[PDB]
Design an enzyme around this catalytic site. Structure first.
Site, PDB file in Angstrom:
ATOM      1  N   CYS A  55      -3.346 -10.961  25.941  1.00 43.33           N
ATOM      2  CA  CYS A  55      -2.094 -10.864  25.196  1.00 43.33           C
ATOM      3  C   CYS A  55      -1.712  -9.407  24.960  1.00 43.33           C
ATOM      4  N   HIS A  56      -2.570  -8.647  24.279  1.00 43.95           N
ATOM      5  CA  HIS A  56      -2.369  -7.204  24.240  1.00 43.95           C
ATOM      6  C   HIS A  56      -2.782  -6.630  25.589  1.00 43.95           C
ATOM      7  N   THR A  94       3.879  11.728 -25.189  1.00 47.59           N
ATOM      8  CA  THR A  94       4.148  12.355 -23.899  1.00 47.59           C
ATOM      9  C   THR A  94       4.436  13.841 -24.071  1.00 47.59           C
ATOM     10  N   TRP A 128     -12.140 -17.053  17.944  1.00 43.85           N
ATOM     11  CA  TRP A 128     -12.219 -17.429  19.350  1.00 43.85           C
ATOM     12  C   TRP A 128     -12.927 -18.763  19.562  1.00 43.85           C
ATOM     13  N   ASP A 130       2.072 -13.984  18.653  1.00 41.51           N
ATOM     14  CA  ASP A 130       2.148 -15.028  17.636  1.00 41.51           C
ATOM     15  C   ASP A 130       2.280 -14.307  16.299  1.00 41.51           C
ATOM     16  N   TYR A 137     -10.718  -9.395  27.430  1.00 43.78           N
ATOM     17  CA  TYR A 137     -10.766  -8.121  26.728  1.00 43.78           C
ATOM     18  C   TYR A 137     -12.204  -7.632  26.618  1.00 43.78           C
ATOM     19  N   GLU A 177     -14.048  -8.513  15.971  1.00 51.18           N
ATOM     20  CA  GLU A 177     -13.439  -8.735  17.278  1.00 51.18           C
ATOM     21  C   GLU A 177     -13.275  -7.423  18.037  1.00 51.18           C
ATOM     22  N   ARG A 206       2.180  -8.897  25.865  1.00 52.87           N
ATOM     23  CA  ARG A 206       3.068  -9.811  26.579  1.00 52.87           C
ATOM     24  C   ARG A 206       3.508 -10.984  25.713  1.00 52.87           C
ATOM     25  N   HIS A 238       7.144 -14.747  19.275  1.00 45.85           N
ATOM     26  CA  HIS A 238       7.454 -16.124  18.922  1.00 45.85           C
ATOM     27  C   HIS A 238       6.792 -16.500  17.602  1.00 45.85           C
TER      28      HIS A 238
HETATM   29  N1  LIG Z   1       2.618   7.588 -15.538  1.00 44.50           N
HETATM   30  C1  LIG Z   1       3.775   8.113 -16.210  1.00 44.50           C
HETATM   31  O1  LIG Z   1       4.846   8.214 -15.590  1.00 44.50           O
HETATM   32  C2  LIG Z   1       3.719   8.560 -17.659  1.00 44.50           C
HETATM   33  C3  LIG Z   1       2.581   8.277 -18.430  1.00 44.50           C
HETATM   34  N2  LIG Z   1       2.504   8.662 -19.717  1.00 44.50           N
HETATM   35  C4  LIG Z   1       1.319   8.347 -20.461  1.00 44.50           C
HETATM   36  O2  LIG Z   1       1.521   7.349 -21.407  1.00 44.50           O
HETATM   37  C5  LIG Z   1       0.735   7.687 -22.552  1.00 44.50           C
HETATM   38  C6  LIG Z   1       1.607   7.911 -23.694  1.00 44.50           C
HETATM   39  O3  LIG Z   1       2.643   6.984 -23.898  1.00 44.50           O
HETATM   40  P1  LIG Z   1       2.757   6.168 -25.297  1.00 44.50           P
HETATM   41  O4  LIG Z   1       1.376   5.613 -25.686  1.00 44.50           O
HETATM   42  O5  LIG Z   1       3.707   5.000 -25.164  1.00 44.50           O
HETATM   43  O6  LIG Z   1       3.317   7.164 -26.405  1.00 44.50           O
HETATM   44  P2  LIG Z   1       4.780   7.798 -26.310  1.00 44.50           P
HETATM   45  O7  LIG Z   1       4.792   8.846 -25.233  1.00 44.50           O
HETATM   46  O8  LIG Z   1       5.809   6.729 -26.008  1.00 44.50           O
HETATM   47  O9  LIG Z   1       5.146   8.478 -27.631  1.00 44.50           O
HETATM   48  C7  LIG Z   1       5.312   7.705 -28.787  1.00 44.50           C
HETATM   49  C8  LIG Z   1       5.898   8.382 -29.951  1.00 44.50           C
HETATM   50  O10 LIG Z   1       7.297   8.484 -29.794  1.00 44.50           O
HETATM   51  C9  LIG Z   1       7.886   8.273 -31.067  1.00 44.50           C
HETATM   52  N3  LIG Z   1       8.666   7.082 -31.086  1.00 44.50           N
HETATM   53  C10 LIG Z   1       8.568   6.042 -30.221  1.00 44.50           C
HETATM   54  N4  LIG Z   1       9.471   5.096 -30.550  1.00 44.50           N
HETATM   55  C11 LIG Z   1      10.170   5.536 -31.649  1.00 44.50           C
HETATM   56  C12 LIG Z   1      11.220   4.999 -32.435  1.00 44.50           C
HETATM   57  N5  LIG Z   1      11.774   3.664 -32.095  1.00 44.50           N
HETATM   58  N6  LIG Z   1      11.712   5.700 -33.492  1.00 44.50           N
HETATM   59  C13 LIG Z   1      11.181   6.918 -33.780  1.00 44.50           C
HETATM   60  N7  LIG Z   1      10.194   7.470 -33.068  1.00 44.50           N
HETATM   61  C14 LIG Z   1       9.661   6.793 -31.984  1.00 44.50           C
HETATM   62  C15 LIG Z   1       6.782   8.167 -32.006  1.00 44.50           C
HETATM   63  O11 LIG Z   1       6.474   9.453 -32.468  1.00 44.50           O
HETATM   64  P3  LIG Z   1       6.075   9.688 -33.957  1.00 44.50           P
HETATM   65  O12 LIG Z   1       4.792   8.888 -34.253  1.00 44.50           O
HETATM   66  O13 LIG Z   1       5.854  11.123 -34.192  1.00 44.50           O
HETATM   67  O14 LIG Z   1       7.173   9.235 -34.868  1.00 44.50           O
HETATM   68  C16 LIG Z   1       5.723   7.626 -31.192  1.00 44.50           C
HETATM   69  O15 LIG Z   1       4.477   7.824 -31.764  1.00 44.50           O
HETATM   70  C17 LIG Z   1       0.001   8.905 -22.193  1.00 44.50           C
HETATM   71  O16 LIG Z   1      -1.205   8.556 -21.592  1.00 44.50           O
HETATM   72  C18 LIG Z   1       0.860   9.518 -21.237  1.00 44.50           C
HETATM   73  O17 LIG Z   1       0.169  10.434 -20.441  1.00 44.50           O
HETATM   74  C19 LIG Z   1       3.531   9.350 -20.306  1.00 44.50           C
HETATM   75  C20 LIG Z   1       4.675   9.653 -19.572  1.00 44.50           C
HETATM   76  C21 LIG Z   1       4.791   9.265 -18.231  1.00 44.50           C
HETATM   77  C1  LIG Z   2       2.266  14.104 -18.693  1.00 41.88           C
HETATM   78  N1  LIG Z   2       3.477  14.127 -17.905  1.00 41.88           N
HETATM   79  C2  LIG Z   2       4.315  12.943 -17.849  1.00 41.88           C
HETATM   80  C3  LIG Z   2       4.549  12.413 -16.455  1.00 41.88           C
HETATM   81  C4  LIG Z   2       3.586  12.652 -15.465  1.00 41.88           C
HETATM   82  N2  LIG Z   2       3.805  12.184 -14.220  1.00 41.88           N
HETATM   83  C5  LIG Z   2       4.950  11.486 -13.930  1.00 41.88           C
HETATM   84  N3  LIG Z   2       5.158  11.015 -12.662  1.00 41.88           N
HETATM   85  C6  LIG Z   2       6.280  10.333 -12.378  1.00 41.88           C
HETATM   86  N4  LIG Z   2       6.487   9.844 -11.039  1.00 41.88           N
HETATM   87  N5  LIG Z   2       7.216  10.093 -13.306  1.00 41.88           N
HETATM   88  C7  LIG Z   2       7.056  10.538 -14.570  1.00 41.88           C
HETATM   89  N6  LIG Z   2       8.053  10.279 -15.556  1.00 41.88           N
HETATM   90  C8  LIG Z   2       5.890  11.262 -14.918  1.00 41.88           C
HETATM   91  N7  LIG Z   2       5.684  11.735 -16.185  1.00 41.88           N
HETATM   92  C9  LIG Z   2       3.843  15.330 -17.166  1.00 41.88           C
HETATM   93  C10 LIG Z   2       2.832  16.203 -16.789  1.00 41.88           C
HETATM   94  C11 LIG Z   2       3.134  17.361 -16.079  1.00 41.88           C
HETATM   95  C12 LIG Z   2       4.451  17.662 -15.751  1.00 41.88           C
HETATM   96  C13 LIG Z   2       4.758  18.924 -14.980  1.00 41.88           C
HETATM   97  O1  LIG Z   2       4.032  19.895 -15.109  1.00 41.88           O
HETATM   98  N8  LIG Z   2       5.881  19.026 -14.079  1.00 41.88           N
HETATM   99  C14 LIG Z   2       6.109  20.259 -13.373  1.00 41.88           C
HETATM  100  C15 LIG Z   2       5.590  20.101 -11.984  1.00 41.88           C
HETATM  101  C16 LIG Z   2       5.105  21.289 -11.210  1.00 41.88           C
HETATM  102  C17 LIG Z   2       4.351  20.980  -9.954  1.00 41.88           C
HETATM  103  O2  LIG Z   2       3.108  20.777 -10.004  1.00 41.88           O
HETATM  104  O3  LIG Z   2       4.896  21.199  -8.846  1.00 41.88           O
HETATM  105  C18 LIG Z   2       7.567  20.479 -13.290  1.00 41.88           C
HETATM  106  O4  LIG Z   2       8.027  21.501 -12.696  1.00 41.88           O
HETATM  107  O5  LIG Z   2       8.350  19.642 -13.808  1.00 41.88           O
HETATM  108  C19 LIG Z   2       5.463  16.791 -16.134  1.00 41.88           C
HETATM  109  C20 LIG Z   2       5.166  15.625 -16.843  1.00 41.88           C
HETATM  110  N1  LIG Z   3      -2.300 -19.379  20.240  1.00 45.14           N
HETATM  111  C1  LIG Z   3      -3.318 -18.476  20.018  1.00 45.14           C
HETATM  112  N2  LIG Z   3      -4.443 -18.468  20.678  1.00 45.14           N
HETATM  113  C2  LIG Z   3      -5.328 -17.471  20.297  1.00 45.14           C
HETATM  114  N3  LIG Z   3      -6.570 -17.262  20.841  1.00 45.14           N
HETATM  115  C3  LIG Z   3      -7.166 -16.187  20.215  1.00 45.14           C
HETATM  116  C4  LIG Z   3      -6.298 -15.698  19.268  1.00 45.14           C
HETATM  117  C5  LIG Z   3      -6.577 -14.535  18.343  1.00 45.14           C
HETATM  118  C6  LIG Z   3      -6.662 -15.046  16.914  1.00 45.14           C
HETATM  119  C7  LIG Z   3      -6.249 -14.248  15.828  1.00 45.14           C
HETATM  120  C8  LIG Z   3      -6.334 -14.747  14.509  1.00 45.14           C
HETATM  121  C9  LIG Z   3      -6.830 -16.050  14.248  1.00 45.14           C
HETATM  122  C10 LIG Z   3      -6.914 -16.578  12.839  1.00 45.14           C
HETATM  123  O1  LIG Z   3      -7.100 -17.776  12.622  1.00 45.14           O
HETATM  124  N4  LIG Z   3      -6.778 -15.622  11.896  1.00 45.14           N
HETATM  125  C11 LIG Z   3      -6.764 -15.636  10.466  1.00 45.14           C
HETATM  126  C12 LIG Z   3      -5.517 -15.468   9.814  1.00 45.14           C
HETATM  127  C13 LIG Z   3      -5.403 -15.448   8.409  1.00 45.14           C
HETATM  128  C14 LIG Z   3      -4.065 -15.276   7.739  1.00 45.14           C
HETATM  129  O2  LIG Z   3      -3.332 -14.212   8.179  1.00 45.14           O
HETATM  130  O3  LIG Z   3      -3.666 -16.046   6.870  1.00 45.14           O
HETATM  131  C15 LIG Z   3      -6.570 -15.601   7.634  1.00 45.14           C
HETATM  132  C16 LIG Z   3      -7.819 -15.763   8.259  1.00 45.14           C
HETATM  133  C17 LIG Z   3      -7.949 -15.779   9.669  1.00 45.14           C
HETATM  134  C18 LIG Z   3      -9.347 -15.961  10.223  1.00 45.14           C
HETATM  135  O4  LIG Z   3      -9.589 -16.541  11.280  1.00 45.14           O
HETATM  136  O5  LIG Z   3     -10.327 -15.430   9.432  1.00 45.14           O
HETATM  137  C19 LIG Z   3      -7.241 -16.846  15.341  1.00 45.14           C
HETATM  138  C20 LIG Z   3      -7.159 -16.343  16.656  1.00 45.14           C
HETATM  139  C21 LIG Z   3      -5.126 -16.529  19.320  1.00 45.14           C
HETATM  140  C22 LIG Z   3      -3.830 -16.583  18.604  1.00 45.14           C
HETATM  141  O6  LIG Z   3      -3.527 -15.794  17.709  1.00 45.14           O
HETATM  142  N5  LIG Z   3      -2.992 -17.566  18.999  1.00 45.14           N
END
Ligand SMILES: NC(=O)C1=CN([C@@H]2O[C@H](COP(=O)(O)OP(=O)(O)OC[C@H]3O[C@@H](n4cnc5c(N)ncnc54)[C@H](OP(=O)(O)O)[C@@H]3O)[C@@H](O)[C@H]2O)C=CC1
Ligand SMILES: CN(Cc1cnc2nc(N)nc(N)c2n1)c1ccc(C(=O)N[C@@H](CCC(=O)O)C(=O)O)cc1
Ligand SMILES: Nc1nc2[nH]cc(Cc3ccc(C(=O)Nc4cc(C(=O)O)ccc4C(=O)O)cc3)c2c(=O)[nH]1
Ligand SMILES: NC(=O)C1=CN([C@@H]2O[C@H](COP(=O)(O)OP(=O)(O)OC[C@H]3O[C@@H](n4cnc5c(N)ncnc54)[C@H](OP(=O)(O)O)[C@@H]3O)[C@@H](O)[C@H]2O)C=CC1
Ligand SMILES: CN(Cc1cnc2nc(N)nc(N)c2n1)c1ccc(C(=O)N[C@@H](CCC(=O)O)C(=O)O)cc1
Ligand SMILES: Nc1nc2[nH]cc(Cc3ccc(C(=O)Nc4cc(C(=O)O)ccc4C(=O)O)cc3)c2c(=O)[nH]1
Ligand SMILES: O=c1[nH]c(=O)n([C@H]2C[C@H](O)[C@@H](COP(=O)(O)O)O2)cc1F
Ligand SMILES: O=c1[nH]c(=O)n([C@H]2C[C@H](O)[C@@H](COP(=O)(O)O)O2)cc1F
Lengths: 506, 506
Positions: free
Chosen positions: B387-388, B56, B301, B411, B327, B279, B408, B449
């Site tokens: 109904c609607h 990361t 229907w 279901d 409708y 529908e 009004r 209901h």
């Molecule tokens: N969607 C999100 O919020 C986020 C997504 N990501 C994504 O995830 C991916 C990366 O994550 P990931 O694959 O898990 O790698 P990491 O980011 O978790 O980094 C792993 C490294 O951390 C060190 N490390 C981890 N555990 C230990 C430990 N128990 N003791 C010592 N060192 C440790 C190691 O470094 P070393 O080998 O040097 O010892 C290891 O290689 C990327 O694609 C990244 O972009 C990352 C952050 C946020």
């Molecule tokens: C790769 N990485 C890890 C990452 C990315 N998205 C995440 N998203 C979420 N919700 N949570 C996380 N922990 C997270 N981590 C990133 C990548 C970019 C920045 C970054 O540039 N942050 C700026 C954001 C600036 C902005 O675009 O406004 C900052 O000010 O912190 C941080 C983490």
């Molecule tokens: N009392 C009474 N009379 C009625 N007259 C006409 C209607 C309108 C109406 C809306 C929906 C269905 C239905 O069966 N919908 C589905 C629900 C699911 C789900 O959400 O699991 C999945 C599939 C279907 C499907 O049909 O593909 C049947 C009628 C009506 C009513 O609603 N009540």
């Protein structure tokens, strides 16, 4: 060092708590709340202390309360040691010895009279305040609850409850002295500007948030409106529209309101209920004559019913206030060939309201209680397309009537409170005619907007802490829904903030 | 003793993180997220340590990162002291000395490779996990992220984001090792049984709450559906209906979905997207012939189009799969005199869809972009009422197309996912025809209901943690909205859980 809480039930406005040595109300649920909050304890080997004045001690019959130790503040009562559940102290400060010694006491509750509350807050011994606001004000008081000092802030406000047609609330006041999720969301919002949907619906700033101290306890359902107001003020895009008055608009909102124990009439602003009722009964009767509303001193449809506005939208052939097939014509005569407001449409069109009532009382578990006003064929004839477009009604297993409303465009300054109250009243009428109780009211809003000439007003409305909802009762049961009259409605316990003038955008 | 967080970006299924010493994707927003989360610090006089493996360390070009101290774990790299921003350690345990000494380090970030993540989790040095899920799986990996151990629980899941048609998520995992407001609400619920509106909408129990550990971070909008599922399981009243299969029903719900950066297609269950599209285009074309859907191997229907079902609902005169004006007939020929499914209705009725497109691209700030299917006059002729029912569309100030839908009856087992996807696709089609980008999708549900024959299935679906939404792209811009074909749609990064068979209630 343990906790101290003032438990009190006071009136909403004047904060009265008693009269002639008794309570000015009889609310059993409030006594149950007192009993449950004073029995709240984390240790089974400890009791809670209830401090009260001598007159309050007389008010409870001079008998102990179960599982609690009563502490009477009195300078005359003999310090009796016979009763182990009751102890007498000469002053309030000496009674605060449960903090130092007496480890068998877990929490302390100040629940005495005005003379106890006043110098319990004055001596600054109180940590929390459980206040029960009661909506009674036209009665007589002689003992009041002191104004809560600014050192306390409200942290909770429950929904409005009803007992014997009396509305009441529950509030908590506190003595004011996981971040990773928040930080991550803030960073993600900094990255994606308006790509993260959260940024398009930002939380309203505290400067436009009604009662900002109440964060987690916004149970009162008037907050369903005030928080929508705040969200529009915060995220509202400045847009133009059909009128010269531009708005701030957002899309897709909802509000919930309870009608079993209250009535969703806003208290942060006095709402003209009579005009709402007259418009609603005008709809129900099937009428489209605006002169019938103007004769009853209701001018909400005057702006859209002037000769200039009708000739401007291309309806100069129509009469003065002949609004055309609108609300209440699609309710009673849907798809009916509209001519003028003077013709007799009895028989033509689909009476949606009658069929709605028939279905509500004949097949309640149905899923089709639907009243629509959107008619694509008659839209061109309308003086104003329907805003409250669709409404659905639902009957619960306990015979309650709930209402969903979809509104395409909502003017939160003027249209929204009117719509809330109007559809609540309509649900209540339908429930009485069908024989049900009112349930819930869900309002779904498409384009929720605030006109720019209301910003000063609505902000003011956001500065007013909400009061409990009132109650709305009917004086008689009617046989047909069209038979309702304004004299039949009783509005109980409505104590709103002063009215807020706002100009309608024509 | 300070905080340690694994920051990683991995694929959604196989959890791959790299290939041939580089990343299997180029997403700039994720690098910005990395930069912002590793520079997050509360002290300005302290730096953050980023531990990474040697490979990361090679992935970032063996150059330091600004304002951060890089710690390379390597058994071969010379412990160089020239660069003060980079230090080398022989093993991972010795690198965990910033906890003991070196108080100039505030937070520690594990950002190495698989070999670093695996024995950083194995040695149990990790407190938090910031995982970026990417929806790429048909590519080649050589370095994977180890399976998250059970000691961790998810507390947050962001919405789905898009970059170069690639969908990705953000999640937080944590290593699991004012009460007064809650107590007051519990007591108020004990008093008022179902009078407190909160008791009618109880919070779902943990046993039916999808991914219960995510409490405050349910940002991913597939939760808008799963939480509704849970709420129906919790508060659903057992009610009968027109079919012999009873349901558990609640009233008044909503769901929001983002369409700018994703596509609301459920991932907790494989959804037949082709049938949904067929529908939808069947609706758009104005068709009511169920045999046209059956010929394209779509049988949704068929239940409502059988001869027995039509003779049972009083339409025995109707042809085999002649569903009637439903409708797409109200969409294209509203108020049109329906005869059979073989007649030519081109010209009759109000073409709501054409006027909708016309209004969307000619008057965008309008508040009337409305498509309705509820027609009281034609309701008796329909094999199944809509109904609607209603849909409204909205153009934002940045030229995006949002959609509200009122339904009004829902279901949640079969109808709801189909409705979500269908109206999302419809909004995207309208946006391309009018020249806008997709916005938001709000779906408002009346009677939500769950059929009782789905309880075993849906519970299973609630046990599957959601994966990011896919992307939906169009291969060509069409001249008319009816010209879309199934071959024109590309669905990118859709990796759902296996399909869950559920029987339709006829
Ligand atoms: N969607 C999100 O919020 C986020 C997504 N990501 C994504 O995830 C991916 C990366 O994550 P990931 O694959 O898990 O790698 P990491 O980011 O978790 O980094 C792993 C490294 O951390 C060190 N490390 C981890 N555990 C230990 C430990 N128990 N003791 C010592 N060192 C440790 C190691 O470094 P070393 O080998 O040097 O010892 C290891 O290689 C990327 O694609 C990244 O972009 C990352 C952050 C946020
Ligand atoms: C790769 N990485 C890890 C990452 C990315 N998205 C995440 N998203 C979420 N919700 N949570 C996380 N922990 C997270 N981590 C990133 C990548 C970019 C920045 C970054 O540039 N942050 C700026 C954001 C600036 C902005 O675009 O406004 C900052 O000010 O912190 C941080 C983490
Ligand atoms: N009392 C009474 N009379 C009625 N007259 C006409 C209607 C309108 C109406 C809306 C929906 C269905 C239905 O069966 N919908 C589905 C629900 C699911 C789900 O959400 O699991 C999945 C599939 C279907 C499907 O049909 O593909 C049947 C009628 C009506 C009513 O609603 N009540
Ligand atoms: N709504 C509610 O939550 C509550 C309402 N109430 C109502 O309030 C009314 C009564 O309250 P209130 O009028 O204020 O009378 P109090 O209950 O406060 O009792 C007053 C008595 O307490 C003693 N006392 C008060 N202050 C002191 C002091 N500083 N030092 C020593 N002794 C003191 C005196 O007893 P002494 O003369 O013997 O020396 C005094 O007469 C009733 O109507 C009652 O029902 C009462 C409790 C709660
Ligand atoms: C006169 N008085 C003072 C009183 C009355 N209401 C209040 N209401 C509130 N919200 N707060 C108070 N401090 C309060 N105090 C009373 C009267 C009756 C009982 C009482 O009988 N409580 C029973 C409750 C029994 C019940 O009805 O279920 C208990 O178990 O404590 C308490 C205080
Ligand atoms: N754009 C646009 N077109 C519209 N067409 C029809 C309406 C409905 C409608 C509701 C309310 C009013 C009003 O004026 N309501 C009041 C508010 C207050 C207050 O807020 O204190 C006090 C008194 C009144 C009152 O009239 O008694 C007027 C019309 C409408 C709209 O709302 N907007
Ligand atoms: O009950 C109503 N509620 C409401 O909010 N309006 C307002 C919404 C909007 O300000 C105006 C209609 O503007 P438009 O027709 O363009 O949606 O009417 C009108 C009503 F009758
Ligand atoms: O698009 C649809 N969405 C939907 O949810 N249903 C379900 C809802 C309900 O289970 C049934 C409608 O029957 P009813 O209107 O009588 O409640 O069909 C049907 C559709 F066609």
């Amino acid at each position: 060092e343990k906790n101290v809480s003032i438990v009190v039930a006071a009136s909403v406005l004047s904060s009265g708590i008693g009269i002639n040595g008794q309570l000015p109300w009889s609310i059993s649920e409030d006594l149950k709340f007192f009993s449950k909050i004073t029995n709240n304890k984390c240790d089974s080997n400890k009791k809670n202390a209830l401090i009260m004045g001598r007159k309050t001690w007389d008010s409870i019959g001079r008998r102990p309360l179960k599982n609690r130790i009563i502490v009477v503040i009195s300078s005359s009562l003999p310090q009796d040691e016979a009763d182990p559940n009751v102890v007498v102290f000469r002053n309030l400060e000496d009674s605060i010895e449960n903090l130092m010694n007496d480890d068998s006491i877990e929490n302390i509750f100040v629940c005495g009279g005005e003379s106890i509350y006043r110098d319990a807050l004055k001596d600054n011994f109180v940590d929390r305040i459980y206040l029960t606001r009661v909506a009674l004000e036209d009665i007589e008081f002689d003992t009041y609850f002191p104004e809560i000092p600014e050192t306390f802030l409200p942290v909770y406000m429950s929904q409005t409850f009803c007992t014997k047609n009396i509305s009441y609330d529950f509030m908590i006041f506190e003595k004011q002295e996981l971040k990773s999720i928040d930080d991550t969301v803030d960073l993600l919002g900094e990255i994606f500007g308006i790509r993260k949907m959260g940024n398009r619906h930002k939380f309203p700033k505290e400067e436009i948030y009604n009662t900002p101290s109440i964060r987690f306890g916004r149970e009162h359902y008037e907050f369903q409106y005030l928080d929508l107001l705040s969200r529009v003020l915060e995220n509202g895009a400045y847009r133009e529209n059909r009128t010269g008055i531009s708005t701030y608009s957002i899309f897709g909102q909802m509000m919930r309101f309870d009608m079993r124990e209250s009535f969703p009439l806003l208290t942060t602003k006095k709402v003209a209920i009579r005009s709402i009722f007259e418009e609603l009964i005008w709809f129900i009767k099937g009428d489209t004559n605006g002169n019938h509303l103007i004769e009853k001193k209701v001018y909400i449809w005057s702006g859209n019913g002037s000769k200039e506005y009708l000739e401007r939208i291309g309806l100069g052939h129509r009469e003065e206030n002949d609004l055309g097939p609108i609300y209440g014509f699609q309710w009673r005569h849907y798809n009916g060939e509209y001519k003028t407001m003077h013709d007799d449409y009895t028989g033509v069109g689909v009476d949606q309201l009658a069929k709605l009532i028939e279905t509500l009382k004949n097949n309640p578990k149905d899923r089709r209680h639907i009243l629509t006003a959107w008619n694509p064929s008659a839209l061109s004839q309308m003086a104003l397309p329907p805003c409250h477009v669709l409404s659905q009604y639902y009957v619960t297993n306990d015979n309650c009537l709930s209402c969903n409303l979809y509104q395409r465009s909502c003017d939160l300054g003027l249209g929204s409170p009117f719509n809330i109250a109007s559809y609540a009243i309509l649900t209540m009428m339908l429930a009485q005619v069908c024989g049900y109780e009112p349930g819930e009211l869900a309002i779904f809003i498409g384009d929720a907007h605030i006109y720019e000439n209301h910003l000063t007003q609505l902000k003011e409305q956001l500065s007013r802490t909400p009061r409990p909802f009132p109650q709305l009762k009917f004086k008689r049961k009617v046989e047909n829904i069209e038979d309702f009259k304004w004299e039949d409605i009783e509005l109980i316990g409505y104590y709103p903030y002063p009215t807020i003038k706002m100009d309608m955008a024509v």
